[model samples]
Target: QSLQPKLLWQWFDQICAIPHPSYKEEQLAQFIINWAKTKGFFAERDEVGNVLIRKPATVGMENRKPVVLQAHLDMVPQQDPILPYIDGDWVKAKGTTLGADNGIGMASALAVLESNDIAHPELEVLLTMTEERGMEGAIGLRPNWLRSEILINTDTEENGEIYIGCAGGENADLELPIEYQVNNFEHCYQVVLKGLRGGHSGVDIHTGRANAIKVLLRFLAELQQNQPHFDFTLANIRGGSIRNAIPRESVATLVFNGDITVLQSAVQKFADVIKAELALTEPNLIFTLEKVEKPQQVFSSQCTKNIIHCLNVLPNGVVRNSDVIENVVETSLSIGVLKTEDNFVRSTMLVRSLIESGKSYVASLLKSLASLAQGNINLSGDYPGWEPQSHSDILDLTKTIYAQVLGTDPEIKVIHAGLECGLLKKIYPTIDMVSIGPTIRNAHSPDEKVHIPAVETYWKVLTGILAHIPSR
Candidate 1:
């Protein structure tokens, strides 16, 4: 017979070629809706602009309940600052974030919607928006409208695992009141941390990568010790756009009076120590100091001490190693944002854990740390973890097809970050769901890549599973 059209990959290639970074899926979402209309499917969009494409069952299989193929339409828009952009038109990441997280799912859904030959029950392709920021679209879904009882989520990051469950997560922000006394240090420099490979805080937090805040805090500790008289305040700091990703870059202001000799020597020594410490994990790590125009405001001694102490005490790495899934991180935390204001210094941290108890414990630990620093902490928002199903029919079907096509069973697993499936289940109880996707690396940060060969293999697995589903 003729070959099944390699449509998913074609769409994926087209998608990556465009820039649909998270919160910027307007054109991309519209493209899929228009494409679906051309295929004679009943496609409509919600008030939030989430797309839903309805695929009617074949003549004999019309009696069965329809299944929903769901994923977010937005991808995290992380790019290297060096990348070019013209506002809304381009998602130029220089070398990072290609939006494959949900873009791939969009492509896969469109591919299925365009097909007329696949045998399956009725289907609805649901593409939600603003997933990376908040699961706003999925949260707004009306359970009464969708006739689909089963949902197959296609936004996972692994190729060999069926993610049956996921962790719930929340972002905590601590805004503190800082008191500053400006001191003119004739010699000033911007201590910058750059070149580290920042990655998905949820997916890569367990990697034990160096945090920019941690490094900067250590430097502050050194300054406090070696040069007691020299005082400095934070000019500004911003790193890691998403709370769920490891920090990539951070900078702090350093001011000193008298000669630059002692400060220069200490700076060299600190750079050496940082490089040596992170050699294995962050080979590209760099520490640089360049003179910049002096800022107007400075921090008081108490404010600087509190901010530095907070960074030093706060554990900013993998907190729990998964006992069930070997090497998989069950829980973790990342301090992705830091800043100094006239009144106080602020920080934002993300905490993720597959186990709710673990999540609660770590979150409490973080809250206590914030309180100890004399800072007010707020648990911004929360999403429930996806619970694993032991006898999930969708997972079983995927496993059977995987073994048939690639000669081995794919691993069944749970991710440490939240997925829309968990929220959808809360809205629509009894919605059977399983997540599958091609292999992707370094998502949510620049350096994201989908394995070239895995795309084709993934498409084959998807079609194979659909063909094997018993039409009720």
Candidate 2:
């Protein structure tokens, strides 16, 4: 509706207009079902609210095994909302993520559903919910729901890469108990760190972009170490939202017992130090300190110290690089969410790795960190990684189709980010799966965008691959 390649853009615009964030996908789900039924296709929604639309073969193609075109129905909610707009040769959202990460994928599937000219095998379009929150839909997918033996996921970000395997992941939640003391200080100020270019924790962990939560902790630790005489009581601190996204902004309220000017100067210098270090990655970083009403209570000195230590020590970036796959992250963890919940402080970390051992390694490290800080650690949503199959029929087919369409060989690689393919393959090991999509930049961040021409190429390659599916 807003850009070229009419059918795909039309659906994408409709999706962006709805607020289908992770767990809140009801509106968009119904929209899809309604649209599919209106087009005279068979549409049904599962108990978990996953939408499935089926279209039979055009004619003699009935013998081919059904092909499932897959994508997530929800997106990672972030920053201020912005309508889709054209910027140069790309489509983006102002001051927020463009949702092109999976929205484009969803659009492509819908386009296929609406097309009568595209010659494809028996098609089953599966749009799952809560994928951004941790592949919840795929985790809860029914074994008997679909008859397809091949699933082509359209969630991969890079245009010319065929993601045959992806990393497994788990979410770790740490809660630290805290006691408050009456704040006798009259001066109160809120320190804010914003404008950092946060991104997808899995895809952009190697970009060297600064995490606001990490930077805030670094500043606080340096402030305490540099000015020992300057005393303050922590009231509240919060940052980030989803565990899969890098923290872009963090805020903290403090009650100071010392001179305001000295504390401000110290914070400014600390910001300057961090900015200088992240100059290349975060050019528009900012730090703001504002006066606020004094809080009645604040975290006790010991708890405040422990909280700072917890944030400072917990690993936040790429932990290990792949020894096998060049330029691929092997194991990594991102401290994506930090907040004050009543009398306790909570932090959520998303741990990812290609191997199960790597995931366990990072989880154990987090557990130890939480234990040492008098916090309780809980891990959930542990999903297996998809190991690369050296002899996949779908991978081989897609490779040839992409090379013919793009005039270059597609890169076949295992992604560090978690994909539903990993979980889907576990339930249906015989299912042939390969993920491909248009070029998306800055996914899960405010700067997210999709290349216009790349979407066209991706569509061509997908249709071409579908047309060449072998008969069962």
Candidate 3:
């Protein structure tokens, strides 16, 4: 027998070994389906790859209303260019993410199914896929698919925080039509921006973390403003992998029609200034400038200027703080991705808000910004926010059970990140729901890790809550 919980760690370790990044969770999904069937439980998969497992109640608890255990199966894929590393206390993946954003939660659900020692009511385990990419599975979920009256989502990151509500979100794409001209300049340089502590856009937007795309645009704008004599043309620019993660690194290729020495000096000075400004939040900021091959063509002067101006003025980070919830963000936006296409330069921003009006407010801003730059705008993945019930029987009961198991009160709170509970609530308005999970630090990034002991505590609270569910 291992020191840790036998079934929980076993399943978690197995999940860790599988590559289950967002939109690529077919293998892991199949594994769960097979495992559930192997355990003699009824299992089925939906169109979008979400898995549903139905487990009967313990010998005498079948009369209780069915309770749903929900967790997303996919995770954000983030990796350090230099390769990830792990210490004894935490685990990290080299050149990839650890997939613990919801993997640990999945493991907890599996542990419950695998064990016969714990007490519980009739159970419905829902493992959703493509959560990190925008809750695709949740959106595609059909009506009347689940027959549960109560749900517990195991996707919250903080061990001691029970999330009752979460912000809705939208993804906005801005594309600026580009016109390029043949590059005649002999001097070319590759500018690389790295060492940023990027994190989940919704969870860490208020942390004052630096965005690489924003920083790179600022640098380019400053270089042009400070040295009016130099003619700089942009050949290519790219950064960020997904629309929900804060960009950690960015690269730009530029061709100069003037002297290289002056450009180098200006770049160094600007990097120093930015480093000083962001030193507190981005201590590892690095800006590199190296000579490179000249490109075939570069963005027209007007196009380059327009792109820089748009990024320089675009609003990012926390937009509003909740007056009702102390120290919580109410609305925010993050410019998560930037890429150069054949005919245009595009940026995708993820906007989040606690209220429906706030979401629209940010979308309007995105439209105006796109118009200002003569760029086209498109929005997708618009999901509603989960509303909190002031008087919930489930909330009242869980508080007593959590305090009993952990010897402390769990914080009842709302999150800025998007959760499947939001969409699921829309389908079943009467369903009572709460989210809980182990402490996962730096989610959606390479630094993600779940506290080992917290997982045990989380498991206890889960079983305790199930045991206390009122009889129907």
Q: Which candidate number maximizes TM-score?
A: 3
User: Each model's C-alpha lDDT?
Assistant: 0.73, 0.87, 0.84
Tell me the lDDT of model 2 at 84: 86
lDDT of 2 by residue, 1-472 (tens): 8565678888888888887877778888998999899988899987778899999986778898789999998887762334889888899887787888799999989988888788889999999879887788888887788888899999998889999888899988889988999889868998899998877888889888888998899888877767778888789999987788888899989888868898789888888888788889998889999999888889998888899888888888999999988889999999899989998899988889999999999988988988899888899989998888767888889999999998989898888888898888888888899999999987776778899999989988998988889989
- TM-score of each model, in listed order: 0.88, 0.90, 0.92
Task: List model 3 lDDT by residue over 173-210, tens digit each.
Answer: 88988899988977899889999988889888889898
Model 3: lDDT to the true structure: 0.84
Q: After the best TM-score superposition of candidate 1, give how far the Cα of residue 379 lies from its true spot, in angstroms.
A: 2.3
The best candidate by lDDT is: 2
Two-way lDDT contest, 2 vs 3, winner:
2
Candidate rank order under lDDT:
2, 3, 1
